[PDB]
From TrEMBL:
Binding site for CoA: 201, 314, 363, 532, 593
Signal peptide: none
Sequence ranges assigned to domain Acetyl-coenzyme A synthetase N-terminal in this UniProt record: 35-91
Organism: Coccidioides immitis (strain RS)
Domain AMP-binding enzyme C-terminal: 540-610
Enzyme kind, highest EC tier: ligase
PANTHER family per record: ACETYL-COENZYME A SYNTHETASE, ACETYL-COENZYME A SYNTHETASE 1
A GO CC term assigned to this protein in UniProt: cytosol
CDD domains: ACS
Domain AMP-dependent synthetase/ligase residues, every copy: 93-483
Protein name: Acetyl-coenzyme A synthetase
GO biological process: acetyl-CoA biosynthetic process from acetate
Gene Ontology molecular function: acetate-CoA ligase activity; AMP binding; ATP binding
Keywords, comma-separated and alphabetical: ATP-binding, Ligase, Nucleotide-binding
C-alpha cells in the first residue's frame, strides 16, 4: 500500500539494552536527540560543525583557514583549505608518541595459529624504513605507487609509507589479471610497484610475482619492483629492477620524517568500474578524506581507542582502504588484517578470529553471511563476549539474513549497522550510528553528519519532497570525504557525478525514503552490477567477450542471485559457426578471466543468433 513498499509493516528495533550494560566505555553520543542536534548543525552550519569535528579528530601541522570552498555544480570543492598535515602522522606517529606498545595491527595469517601483533612503535618503524626504500629508489611527493598485495600487514605498511612521503598509492586488488594491473599502472603512470612473491589465501597459492612480471612487460616506466617474500617460492627475478623488501629495509633507519602535505594534496587513487568506459581512478585527497574516515569510525562504528576492529573487506577495495586501514588507525585502536577466507580451514574461521582476538566490531558483506548461514549454525559456537557492533556493507542486509546476524551471530547483544556508501563518497553516508540509531531490517536508516540526501524524479530530475517517496538518490551538498576527481579526466568526473543533475551529487543508486524518513537503497540505475561484493561494469565484461575472435556482439546484464546478490549473465552473437559450442563457452569464460579476473567471469555465456 505505501510508495516505498519495502518498508510496509517494518517497525524499528531499538539498540539492545545489554549493549549499554556491557559497554567498556559509553557511546560518543547521548542518544538520538544529540544525533539530531549535531546532524542539523552539520547541514545548517557545516563551516562550524566540520571545523570542530576536524580539529577534534585530526592533528594538523598547520591549522586550516576555511572549512570549505567551492560548490557541487562547480566541481571545485576543497575542504580545510590552508591546512597542512600528514596521514601517516595521524595514523601512526601521534599514537606511537603516546602509547608505543599499544597493539596497532593484529595479523591473522591464512593458516590459523600463525600471524602476529604489531605495536604502534613497530608500525612506525616499518612504515619509516619502507618509505626510506621508496625515497632511495627515487619516489617523490606526488608520484603514484602501484600496490599489488594480499591481506598482510605489509599492505598497511605500504599504504602508509606512500602517505608518509606524499606519494599517491594506487592499490590494485590482488585478484586482478595482469591486463587489469597493467591498465591501472599505465593510467596512474606509476614508476614503482610493491608486490609479493606469492599470496596464500584459503590454502591456495596466488602467483603474484608472475602476474606482475607479465604486466610490467608493457609498463616500461616502472623501474623498480619491491617484492615481499611471503612464501619463499622460487619466482622469476629481474636483476636491476626487482628488489627484496627484507633486504632493502635492513639498509635504512627505523624513523623517517613525514612529508608536509596540503589538505588537498592527493592521498590515493582507487580504480573503480563505472557505467561507461574503462575503470576510473577515483582520487581522494588528504584532510577531508581522513576527517570522514575518523568521524565515521567514531560515530558509526562506536570506536574507542581500546577497541579491536575487524573489517573483512580487502585492501583492494574502498572498504579496506577506509575501515581496515585509515579509520581505526586514525582513532588509535587495533585493526585486524585477515589473510584467509571465512571458509578456511572451516566455516568457523570468522568466529575463531573474533573470539581469539576479543574483537569488538566486525564489518562484513552480506554475501559472506549468506554463505555462512547456508553452511549451518553448528559452525558458530563462540562466546565472542566483546562483540558489540555488527556492520554490513555492499547491499541491503535482508530480513532473513538480518535476523540471523542479529540472533545467531550477535546473540541479540550487538547492534547491526547497515552502512550505505561507495568508493566516491570516501566513508559512510547513510547508516545507523552504532549504539544510537533504531534500525529497520533492510534499511540503511538515516544520513550521516553532513549528508543531505534528496530523492529526484529520474526523468525530470525534480526533487520529490516529503516522505514515502521513491526515485534517484542524490546529495544536495558537498561533504568532506567526497572524491575530488577522476585521475586525468576531470571532465568525466564532472559528467558522471555533477552534470547529470546540476546542483546535486548523483550516486547512481535508486532509493526510497519511507514514512519515517528512513532510506531504502534499491541499487544501481546504471550498468553497474554488484556481484559477491565486486562492483562490475557490464560494459567492461562485454568488451572482454568481444576480444574473442568468434564473438561479434555481446550483451551482459545483472540478475538477482540468492547467494552472490546478483549474477552477471552474458549473451554473445557469433561471427560464424562453432561446432565446439560447449567448448567455446569455456574459452569465453577464460577470456573474461584474462581480461579482468576470475571474479568477473559470467556464470554462463549464451551463444545466440541475434
Ligand atoms: C562501499 C563498498 C562498496 O563500494 P563500491 O563503490 O564498490 O560500490 C558502491 C555501490 O554498492 C552498493 N551499496 C553499498 N553499500 C550498500 C548498502 N549498505 N546497501 C545497498 N547498496 C549498497 C550501491 O549500489 C553503491 O552505489
Amino acid at each position: 500500500l505505501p510508495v516505498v513498499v519495502e518498508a510496509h509493516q517494518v517497525d524499528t528495533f531499538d539498540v539492545p539494552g545489554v549493549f549499554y550494560e556491557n559497554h567498556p566505555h559509553e557511546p560518543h553520543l547521548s542518544g538520538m536527540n544529540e544525533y539530531n542536534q549535531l546532524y542539523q548543525q552539520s547541514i545548517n552550519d557545516p563551516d562550524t560543525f566540520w571545523a570542530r569535528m576536524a580539529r577534534d579528530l585530526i592533528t594538523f601541522e598547520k591549522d586550516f583557514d576555511k572549512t570549505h570552498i567551492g560548490t557541487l555544480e562547480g566541481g571545485d570543492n576543497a575542504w580545510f583549505v590552508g591546512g597542512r598535515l600528514n596521514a601517516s602522522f595521524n595514523c601512526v606517529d601521534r599514537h606511537a608518541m603516546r602509547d608505543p606498545n599499544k597493539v596497532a595491527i593484529i595479523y591473522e595469517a591464512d593458516e590459523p595459529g600463525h600471524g602476529r601483533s604489531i605495536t604502534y612503535a613497530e608500525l612506525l618503524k616499518e612504515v619509516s624504513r619502507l618509505a626510506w626504500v621508496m625515497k632511495s629508489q627515487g619516489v617523490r611527493k606526488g608520484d603514484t605507487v602501484a600496490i599489488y598485495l594480499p591481506m598482510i600487514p605489509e599492505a598497511i605498511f605500504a599504504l602508509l609509507a606512500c602517505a608518509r612521503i606524499g606519494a599517491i598509492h594506487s592499490v590494485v586488488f590482488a585478484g586482478f589479471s595482469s591486463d587489469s594491473l597493467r591498465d591501472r599502472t599505465l593510467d596512474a603512470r606509476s614508476k614503482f610497484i610493491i608486490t609479493t612473491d606469492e599470496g596464500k589465501r584459503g590454502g591456495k597459492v596466488i602467483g603474484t610475482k608472475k602476474i606482475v612480471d607479465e604486466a610490467l612487460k608493457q609498463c616500461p616506466d616502472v623501474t623498480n619492483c619491491l617484492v615481499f617474500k611471503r612464501t619463499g617460492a622460487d619466482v622469476p627475478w629481474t636483476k636491476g629492477r626487482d628488489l627484496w623488501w627484507h633486504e632493502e629495509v635492513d639498509k635504512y633507519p627505523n624513523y623517517l620524517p613525514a612529508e608536509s602535505m596540503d589538505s588537498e594534496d592527493p592521498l590515493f587513487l582507487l580504480y573503480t568500474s563505472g557505467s561507461t568506459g574503462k575503470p576510473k581512478g577515483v582520487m581522494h585527497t588528504t584532510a577531508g578524506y581522513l576527517v570522514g574516515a575518523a568521524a565515521t569510525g567514531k560515530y558509526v562504528f562506536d570506536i574507542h581507542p581500546a577497541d579491536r576492529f575487524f573489517c573483512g573487506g580487502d585492501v583492494g577495495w574502498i572498504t579496506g582502504h577506509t575501515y581496515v586501514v585509515y579509520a581505526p588507525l586514525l582513532l588509535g585502536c587495533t585493526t585486524v588484517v585477515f589473510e584467509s577466507t571465512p571458509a578456511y580451514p572451516n566455516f568457523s574461521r570468522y568466529w575463531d578470529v573474533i573470539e581469539k582476538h576479543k574483537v569488538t566490531q566486525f564489518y562484513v558483506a552480506p554475501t559472506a553471511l549468506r554463505l555462512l548461514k547456508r553452511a549451518g549454525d553448528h559452525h558458530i559456537n563462540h562466546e565472542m563476549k566483546d562483540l558489540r557492533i555488527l556492520g554490513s556493507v555492499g547491499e541491503p542486509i535482508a530480513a532473513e539474513v538480518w535476523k540471523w546476524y542479529h540472533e545467531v551471530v550477535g546473540k541479540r547483544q550487538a547492534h547491526i549497522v547497515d552502512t550505505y556508501w561507495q568508493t566516491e563518497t570516501g566513508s559512510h553516508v547513510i547508516t545507523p550510528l552504532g549504539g544510537i540509531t533504531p534500525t529497520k531490517p533492510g534499511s540503511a536508516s538515516l544520513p550521516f553528519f553532513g549528508i543531505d540526501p534528496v530523492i529526484l524524479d529520474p526523468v525530470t530530475g525534480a526533487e520529490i519532497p516529503g516522505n514515502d517517496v521513491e526515485g534517484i538518490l542524490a546529495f544536495r551538498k558537498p561533504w568532506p570525504s567526497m572524491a575530488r576527481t577522476v585521475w586525468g579526466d576531470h571532465k568525466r568526473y564532472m559528467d558522471t557525478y555533477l552534470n547529470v543533475y546540476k546542483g546535486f551529487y548523483f550516486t547512481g543508486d535508486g532509493a526510497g525514503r519511507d514514512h519515517e524518513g528512513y532510506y531504502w537503497i534499491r541499487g544501481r540505475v546504471d550498468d553497474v552490477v554488484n556481484v559477491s561484493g565486486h562492483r562490475l561494469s557490464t560494459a567492461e565484461i562485454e568488451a572482454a567477450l568481444i576480444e574473442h575472435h568468434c564473438v561479434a556482439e555481446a550483451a551482459v546484464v545483472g540478475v538477482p542471485d540468492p547467494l552472490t546478490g546478483q549474477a552477471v549473465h552474458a549473451f554473445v552473437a557469433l561471427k560464424s559457426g562453432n561446432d565446439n559450442r560447449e567448448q567455446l563457452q569455456k574459452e569465453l569464460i577464460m577470456q573474461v578471466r584474462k581480461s579482468i579476473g576470475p571474479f568477473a567471469a559470467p556464470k554462463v555465456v549464451f551463444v545466440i543468433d541475434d
